[PDB]
């Protein structure tokens, strides 16, 4: 795929995610633990976008004849890149499940929530996520030639998709009890359609933007030299593009849905 299509998304995600980080840092109604995980997501998405954009630029140069360094340094640059990309991918997924777990605790542990999560525990969990993701990224890129790393990445994606689906279907199924109870109210002058739309626009975006890459991996392992699987693998670029489309579209579905953040958006844009 053309490098233009792949750098455009990087710049768009950089802009959106810097804006989200500012809107959380520059507002105090948005200092809850949830918005700390939204800011972690914004940082991780920002890094995926920019790290992939700069690889693309450097690949565009090395394969062309504009800038040539020997074999050892080409390899050494390449690695650093992939490394950053992997750390930021794992951080992005972990920061989606952080928001999901936070929402789940706020709903289903509603009356005890501030005995569970404070602002400091948010920072502890964020720092732990990023140290763990850095370790995983470096191990995964230095040991890429094995089956073992790719199985680890695949297992992480499936484990972290199962849990997100399970964390949101429960929330929607409870919201339906409440909507049914509102409906029974007399003189009801209330839409499960809203809940259905949100559940879809969260899970489906996650799945569409993250599942092709991991199917590519799980067919690289399984069936590497069969016509169907080979035709699937041959679309690595069309799967990386979806990975970055996730970065573009996460701020829409988490930050842009808050009324307070949409007010901070107006305040920031008028500066």
């Amino acid at each position: 795929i053309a490098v233009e299509v792949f750098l455009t998304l990087g710049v768009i995600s950089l802009l959106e995610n810097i804006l989200v980080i500012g809107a959380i840092v520059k507002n105090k109604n948005l200092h809850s633990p949830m918005y700390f995980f939204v800011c972690s997501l914004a940082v991780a998405d920002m890094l995926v976008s920019m790290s992939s954009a700069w690889e693309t630029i450097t690949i565009y140069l090395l394969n062309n004849k504009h800038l040539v360094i020997a074999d050892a340094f080409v390899r050494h640059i390449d690695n650093v890149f992939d490394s950053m990309i992997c750390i930021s991918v794992v951080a992005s997924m972990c920061s989606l499940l952080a928001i999901a777990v936070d929402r789940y605790v706020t709903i289903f542990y509603a009356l005890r929530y501030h005995h569970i999560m404070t602002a400091r525990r948010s920072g502890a969990i964020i720092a732990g996520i990023w140290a763990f993701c850095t370790g995983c990224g470096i191990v995964f890129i230095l040991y890429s030639e094995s089956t073992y790393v790719i199985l680890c990445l695949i297992s992480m994606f499936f484990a972290m998709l199962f849990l997100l689906v399970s964390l949101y279907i429960h929330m929607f199924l409870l919201a339906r009890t409440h909507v049914k109870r509102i409906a029974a109210l007399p003189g009801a002058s209330r839409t499960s359609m809203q809940g259905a739309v949100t559940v879809t626009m969260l899970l489906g975006v996650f799945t569409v933007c993250w599942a092709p890459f991991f199917l590519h991996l799980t067919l690289m392992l399984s069936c590497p030299q069969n016509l169907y699987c080979s035709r699937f693998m041959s679309h690595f670029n069309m799967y990386l593009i979806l990975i970055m489309c996730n970065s573009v579209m996460d701020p829409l579905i988490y930050a842009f849905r808050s009324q307070e953040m949409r007010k901070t958006f107006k305040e920031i844009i008028c500066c």
């Binding site: 690889e55 450097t58 690949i59």
Partner: peptide
């Protein structure tokens, strides 16, 4: 040589 390519895990190993 070592042709560089998008991120990692692309061509079959």
């Amino acid at each position: 040589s070592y042709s560089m390519e998008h991120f990692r895990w692309g061509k079959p190993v």
